[PDB]
PDB file of all heavy atoms in Angstrom:
ATOM      1  N   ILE C  40     -17.336 -30.356 -28.373  1.00  0.00           N
ATOM      2  CA  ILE C  40     -16.061 -29.781 -28.307  1.00  0.00           C
ATOM      3  C   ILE C  40     -16.249 -28.280 -28.063  1.00  0.00           C
ATOM      4  O   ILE C  40     -17.052 -27.543 -28.667  1.00  0.00           O
ATOM      5  CB  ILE C  40     -15.290 -29.905 -29.637  1.00  0.00           C
ATOM      6  CG1 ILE C  40     -15.158 -31.446 -30.000  1.00  0.00           C
ATOM      7  CG2 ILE C  40     -13.891 -29.318 -29.642  1.00  0.00           C
ATOM      8  CD1 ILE C  40     -15.009 -31.758 -31.499  1.00  0.00           C
ATOM      9  N   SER C  41     -15.566 -27.741 -27.036  1.00  0.00           N
ATOM     10  CA  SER C  41     -15.587 -26.377 -26.651  1.00  0.00           C
ATOM     11  C   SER C  41     -14.494 -25.602 -27.300  1.00  0.00           C
ATOM     12  O   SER C  41     -13.391 -25.990 -27.447  1.00  0.00           O
ATOM     13  CB  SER C  41     -15.404 -26.356 -25.101  1.00  0.00           C
ATOM     14  OG  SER C  41     -16.008 -27.320 -24.372  1.00  0.00           O
ATOM     15  N   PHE C  42     -14.887 -24.454 -27.820  1.00  0.00           N
ATOM     16  CA  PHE C  42     -14.001 -23.351 -28.371  1.00  0.00           C
ATOM     17  C   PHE C  42     -13.318 -22.758 -27.045  1.00  0.00           C
ATOM     18  O   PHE C  42     -13.916 -22.621 -26.116  1.00  0.00           O
ATOM     19  CB  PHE C  42     -14.763 -22.299 -29.209  1.00  0.00           C
ATOM     20  CG  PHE C  42     -15.453 -22.807 -30.374  1.00  0.00           C
ATOM     21  CD1 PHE C  42     -16.669 -22.285 -30.777  1.00  0.00           C
ATOM     22  CD2 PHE C  42     -14.943 -23.836 -31.148  1.00  0.00           C
ATOM     23  CE1 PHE C  42     -17.347 -22.710 -31.865  1.00  0.00           C
ATOM     24  CE2 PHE C  42     -15.585 -24.216 -32.304  1.00  0.00           C
ATOM     25  CZ  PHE C  42     -16.755 -23.768 -32.636  1.00  0.00           C
ATOM     26  N   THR C  43     -12.018 -22.474 -27.191  1.00  0.00           N
ATOM     27  CA  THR C  43     -11.369 -21.701 -26.216  1.00  0.00           C
ATOM     28  C   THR C  43     -10.848 -20.369 -26.808  1.00  0.00           C
ATOM     29  O   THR C  43     -10.030 -19.701 -26.117  1.00  0.00           O
ATOM     30  CB  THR C  43     -10.226 -22.442 -25.522  1.00  0.00           C
ATOM     31  OG1 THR C  43      -9.236 -22.887 -26.437  1.00  0.00           O
ATOM     32  CG2 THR C  43     -10.843 -23.663 -24.771  1.00  0.00           C
ATOM     33  N   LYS C  44     -11.377 -20.030 -27.977  1.00  0.00           N
ATOM     34  CA  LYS C  44     -11.052 -18.732 -28.560  1.00  0.00           C
ATOM     35  C   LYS C  44     -12.328 -18.327 -29.430  1.00  0.00           C
ATOM     36  O   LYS C  44     -13.010 -19.226 -29.920  1.00  0.00           O
ATOM     37  CB  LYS C  44      -9.810 -18.781 -29.479  1.00  0.00           C
ATOM     38  CG  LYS C  44      -8.701 -17.969 -28.849  1.00  0.00           C
ATOM     39  CD  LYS C  44      -7.799 -18.775 -28.150  1.00  0.00           C
ATOM     40  CE  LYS C  44      -6.993 -17.949 -27.172  1.00  0.00           C
ATOM     41  NZ  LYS C  44      -6.430 -18.740 -26.003  1.00  0.00           N
ATOM     42  N   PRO C  45     -12.597 -17.070 -29.648  1.00  0.00           N
ATOM     43  CA  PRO C  45     -13.554 -16.709 -30.638  1.00  0.00           C
ATOM     44  C   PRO C  45     -13.482 -17.268 -32.003  1.00  0.00           C
ATOM     45  O   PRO C  45     -14.385 -17.461 -32.746  1.00  0.00           O
ATOM     46  CB  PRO C  45     -13.516 -15.195 -30.611  1.00  0.00           C
ATOM     47  CG  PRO C  45     -12.910 -14.789 -29.337  1.00  0.00           C
ATOM     48  CD  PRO C  45     -11.933 -15.889 -29.030  1.00  0.00           C
ATOM     49  N   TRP C  46     -12.159 -17.477 -32.404  1.00  0.00           N
ATOM     50  CA  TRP C  46     -11.801 -18.004 -33.731  1.00  0.00           C
ATOM     51  C   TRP C  46     -11.539 -19.386 -33.902  1.00  0.00           C
ATOM     52  O   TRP C  46     -11.040 -19.828 -34.948  1.00  0.00           O
ATOM     53  CB  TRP C  46     -10.652 -17.038 -34.304  1.00  0.00           C
ATOM     54  CG  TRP C  46      -9.517 -16.908 -33.337  1.00  0.00           C
ATOM     55  CD1 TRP C  46      -9.333 -15.824 -32.532  1.00  0.00           C
ATOM     56  CD2 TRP C  46      -8.376 -17.731 -33.165  1.00  0.00           C
ATOM     57  NE1 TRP C  46      -8.232 -15.945 -31.807  1.00  0.00           N
ATOM     58  CE2 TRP C  46      -7.682 -17.101 -32.116  1.00  0.00           C
ATOM     59  CE3 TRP C  46      -8.076 -18.942 -33.571  1.00  0.00           C
ATOM     60  CZ2 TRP C  46      -6.348 -17.675 -31.573  1.00  0.00           C
ATOM     61  CZ3 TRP C  46      -6.847 -19.589 -33.094  1.00  0.00           C
ATOM     62  CH2 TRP C  46      -6.071 -18.951 -32.128  1.00  0.00           C
ATOM     63  N   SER C  47     -11.994 -20.163 -32.903  1.00  0.00           N
ATOM     64  CA  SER C  47     -11.719 -21.655 -32.884  1.00  0.00           C
ATOM     65  C   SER C  47     -12.457 -22.429 -33.913  1.00  0.00           C
ATOM     66  O   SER C  47     -12.198 -23.620 -34.175  1.00  0.00           O
ATOM     67  CB  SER C  47     -11.971 -22.211 -31.433  1.00  0.00           C
ATOM     68  OG  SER C  47     -10.878 -21.924 -30.599  1.00  0.00           O
ATOM     69  N   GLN C  48     -13.493 -21.800 -34.557  1.00  0.00           N
ATOM     70  CA  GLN C  48     -14.252 -22.402 -35.603  1.00  0.00           C
ATOM     71  C   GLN C  48     -13.539 -22.328 -36.927  1.00  0.00           C
ATOM     72  O   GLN C  48     -13.966 -22.889 -37.968  1.00  0.00           O
ATOM     73  CB  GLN C  48     -15.633 -21.747 -35.721  1.00  0.00           C
ATOM     74  CG  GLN C  48     -16.620 -22.426 -36.764  1.00  0.00           C
ATOM     75  CD  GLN C  48     -18.074 -22.483 -36.367  1.00  0.00           C
ATOM     76  OE1 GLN C  48     -18.458 -22.900 -35.313  1.00  0.00           O
ATOM     77  NE2 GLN C  48     -18.926 -21.975 -37.256  1.00  0.00           N
ATOM     78  N   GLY C  49     -12.311 -21.660 -36.935  1.00  0.00           N
ATOM     79  CA  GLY C  49     -11.523 -21.494 -38.129  1.00  0.00           C
ATOM     80  C   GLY C  49     -12.275 -20.699 -39.115  1.00  0.00           C
ATOM     81  O   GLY C  49     -12.895 -19.677 -38.814  1.00  0.00           O
ATOM     82  N   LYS C  50     -12.303 -21.156 -40.407  1.00  0.00           N
ATOM     83  CA  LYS C  50     -13.056 -20.700 -41.447  1.00  0.00           C
ATOM     84  C   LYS C  50     -14.209 -21.527 -42.044  1.00  0.00           C
ATOM     85  O   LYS C  50     -14.634 -21.330 -43.222  1.00  0.00           O
ATOM     86  CB  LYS C  50     -12.158 -20.177 -42.624  1.00  0.00           C
ATOM     87  CG  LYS C  50     -11.464 -18.808 -42.340  1.00  0.00           C
ATOM     88  CD  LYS C  50     -12.538 -17.666 -42.150  1.00  0.00           C
ATOM     89  CE  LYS C  50     -11.791 -16.411 -41.738  1.00  0.00           C
ATOM     90  NZ  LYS C  50     -12.883 -15.285 -41.543  1.00  0.00           N
ATOM     91  N   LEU C  51     -14.639 -22.476 -41.126  1.00  0.00           N
ATOM     92  CA  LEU C  51     -15.691 -23.397 -41.450  1.00  0.00           C
ATOM     93  C   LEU C  51     -17.014 -22.791 -41.099  1.00  0.00           C
ATOM     94  O   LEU C  51     -17.156 -22.067 -40.099  1.00  0.00           O
ATOM     95  CB  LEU C  51     -15.461 -24.685 -40.830  1.00  0.00           C
ATOM     96  CG  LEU C  51     -14.148 -25.399 -40.803  1.00  0.00           C
ATOM     97  CD1 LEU C  51     -14.222 -26.748 -40.038  1.00  0.00           C
ATOM     98  CD2 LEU C  51     -13.583 -25.662 -42.161  1.00  0.00           C
ATOM     99  N   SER C  52     -18.092 -23.077 -41.870  1.00  0.00           N
ATOM    100  CA  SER C  52     -19.405 -22.698 -41.549  1.00  0.00           C
ATOM    101  C   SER C  52     -19.971 -23.559 -40.326  1.00  0.00           C
ATOM    102  O   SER C  52     -19.414 -24.483 -39.997  1.00  0.00           O
ATOM    103  CB  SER C  52     -20.378 -22.826 -42.706  1.00  0.00           C
ATOM    104  OG  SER C  52     -20.800 -24.209 -42.934  1.00  0.00           O
ATOM    105  N   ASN C  53     -21.087 -23.059 -39.724  1.00  0.00           N
ATOM    106  CA  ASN C  53     -21.727 -23.741 -38.703  1.00  0.00           C
ATOM    107  C   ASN C  53     -21.941 -25.272 -38.898  1.00  0.00           C
ATOM    108  O   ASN C  53     -21.504 -26.005 -38.048  1.00  0.00           O
ATOM    109  CB  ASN C  53     -23.000 -23.019 -38.253  1.00  0.00           C
ATOM    110  CG  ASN C  53     -22.860 -21.654 -37.682  1.00  0.00           C
ATOM    111  OD1 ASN C  53     -21.949 -20.923 -38.167  1.00  0.00           O
ATOM    112  ND2 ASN C  53     -23.752 -21.244 -36.853  1.00  0.00           N
ATOM    113  N   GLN C  54     -22.628 -25.555 -39.958  1.00  0.00           N
ATOM    114  CA  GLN C  54     -22.875 -26.949 -40.332  1.00  0.00           C
ATOM    115  C   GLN C  54     -21.586 -27.657 -40.707  1.00  0.00           C
ATOM    116  O   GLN C  54     -21.395 -28.844 -40.385  1.00  0.00           O
ATOM    117  CB  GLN C  54     -23.858 -27.093 -41.556  1.00  0.00           C
ATOM    118  CG  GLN C  54     -23.387 -26.594 -42.829  1.00  0.00           C
ATOM    119  CD  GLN C  54     -23.765 -27.486 -43.972  1.00  0.00           C
ATOM    120  OE1 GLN C  54     -24.933 -27.740 -44.358  1.00  0.00           O
ATOM    121  NE2 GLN C  54     -22.705 -28.327 -44.477  1.00  0.00           N
ATOM    122  N   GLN C  55     -20.654 -27.018 -41.466  1.00  0.00           N
ATOM    123  CA  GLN C  55     -19.316 -27.564 -41.866  1.00  0.00           C
ATOM    124  C   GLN C  55     -18.599 -27.975 -40.542  1.00  0.00           C
ATOM    125  O   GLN C  55     -17.896 -29.088 -40.593  1.00  0.00           O
ATOM    126  CB  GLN C  55     -18.520 -26.538 -42.710  1.00  0.00           C
ATOM    127  CG  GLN C  55     -17.485 -27.152 -43.465  1.00  0.00           C
ATOM    128  CD  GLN C  55     -16.914 -26.111 -44.504  1.00  0.00           C
ATOM    129  OE1 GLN C  55     -17.287 -24.996 -44.521  1.00  0.00           O
ATOM    130  NE2 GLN C  55     -15.967 -26.564 -45.361  1.00  0.00           N
ATOM    131  N   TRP C  56     -18.710 -27.231 -39.531  1.00  0.00           N
ATOM    132  CA  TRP C  56     -18.236 -27.533 -38.238  1.00  0.00           C
ATOM    133  C   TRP C  56     -18.874 -28.714 -37.547  1.00  0.00           C
ATOM    134  O   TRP C  56     -18.264 -29.633 -37.008  1.00  0.00           O
ATOM    135  CB  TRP C  56     -18.194 -26.358 -37.289  1.00  0.00           C
ATOM    136  CG  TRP C  56     -17.757 -26.707 -35.813  1.00  0.00           C
ATOM    137  CD1 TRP C  56     -18.579 -26.762 -34.738  1.00  0.00           C
ATOM    138  CD2 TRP C  56     -16.589 -27.163 -35.375  1.00  0.00           C
ATOM    139  NE1 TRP C  56     -17.897 -27.094 -33.648  1.00  0.00           N
ATOM    140  CE2 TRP C  56     -16.664 -27.346 -33.923  1.00  0.00           C
ATOM    141  CE3 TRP C  56     -15.204 -27.241 -35.987  1.00  0.00           C
ATOM    142  CZ2 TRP C  56     -15.520 -27.734 -33.299  1.00  0.00           C
ATOM    143  CZ3 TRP C  56     -14.185 -27.547 -35.159  1.00  0.00           C
ATOM    144  CH2 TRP C  56     -14.327 -27.897 -33.820  1.00  0.00           C
ATOM    145  N   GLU C  57     -20.195 -28.677 -37.554  1.00  0.00           N
ATOM    146  CA  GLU C  57     -20.978 -29.705 -36.970  1.00  0.00           C
ATOM    147  C   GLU C  57     -20.897 -31.073 -37.581  1.00  0.00           C
ATOM    148  O   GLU C  57     -21.041 -32.095 -36.929  1.00  0.00           O
ATOM    149  CB  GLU C  57     -22.451 -29.331 -36.910  1.00  0.00           C
ATOM    150  CG  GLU C  57     -22.882 -28.461 -35.718  1.00  0.00           C
ATOM    151  CD  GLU C  57     -23.299 -29.321 -34.471  1.00  0.00           C
ATOM    152  OE1 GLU C  57     -22.865 -30.508 -34.401  1.00  0.00           O
ATOM    153  OE2 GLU C  57     -23.992 -28.683 -33.500  1.00  0.00           O
ATOM    154  N   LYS C  58     -20.557 -31.008 -38.888  1.00  0.00           N
ATOM    155  CA  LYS C  58     -20.300 -32.221 -39.679  1.00  0.00           C
ATOM    156  C   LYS C  58     -18.938 -32.892 -39.086  1.00  0.00           C
ATOM    157  O   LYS C  58     -19.005 -34.139 -38.798  1.00  0.00           O
ATOM    158  CB  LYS C  58     -20.146 -31.944 -41.165  1.00  0.00           C
ATOM    159  CG  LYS C  58     -20.008 -33.173 -42.032  1.00  0.00           C
ATOM    160  CD  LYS C  58     -20.003 -32.771 -43.551  1.00  0.00           C
ATOM    161  CE  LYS C  58     -20.385 -33.879 -44.407  1.00  0.00           C
ATOM    162  NZ  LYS C  58     -19.324 -35.029 -44.401  1.00  0.00           N
ATOM    163  N   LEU C  59     -17.962 -32.065 -38.930  1.00  0.00           N
ATOM    164  CA  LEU C  59     -16.711 -32.542 -38.357  1.00  0.00           C
ATOM    165  C   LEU C  59     -16.769 -32.909 -36.933  1.00  0.00           C
ATOM    166  O   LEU C  59     -16.129 -33.858 -36.520  1.00  0.00           O
ATOM    167  CB  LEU C  59     -15.749 -31.362 -38.517  1.00  0.00           C
ATOM    168  CG  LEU C  59     -14.236 -31.531 -38.308  1.00  0.00           C
ATOM    169  CD1 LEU C  59     -13.610 -32.454 -39.438  1.00  0.00           C
ATOM    170  CD2 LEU C  59     -13.468 -30.255 -38.089  1.00  0.00           C
ATOM    171  N   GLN C  60     -17.660 -32.241 -36.170  1.00  0.00           N
ATOM    172  CA  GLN C  60     -17.864 -32.539 -34.730  1.00  0.00           C
ATOM    173  C   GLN C  60     -18.525 -33.913 -34.565  1.00  0.00           C
ATOM    174  O   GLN C  60     -18.013 -34.744 -33.728  1.00  0.00           O
ATOM    175  CB  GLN C  60     -18.680 -31.519 -34.018  1.00  0.00           C
ATOM    176  CG  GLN C  60     -18.726 -31.658 -32.507  1.00  0.00           C
ATOM    177  CD  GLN C  60     -19.420 -30.651 -31.827  1.00  0.00           C
ATOM    178  OE1 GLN C  60     -18.929 -30.038 -30.752  1.00  0.00           O
ATOM    179  NE2 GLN C  60     -20.532 -30.106 -32.307  1.00  0.00           N
TER     180      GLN C  60
END
Side-chain angles (χ1 to χ4, degrees):
Chain C
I40 303 153
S41 321
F42 301 141
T43 58
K44 249 97 202 159
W46 44 265
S47 285
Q48 185 146 306
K50 280 297 172 183
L51 314 180
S52 81
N53 295 33
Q54 71 133 73
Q55 202 168 2
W56 170 252
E57 273 273 21
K58 190 173 198 296
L59 194 71
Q60 190 178 222

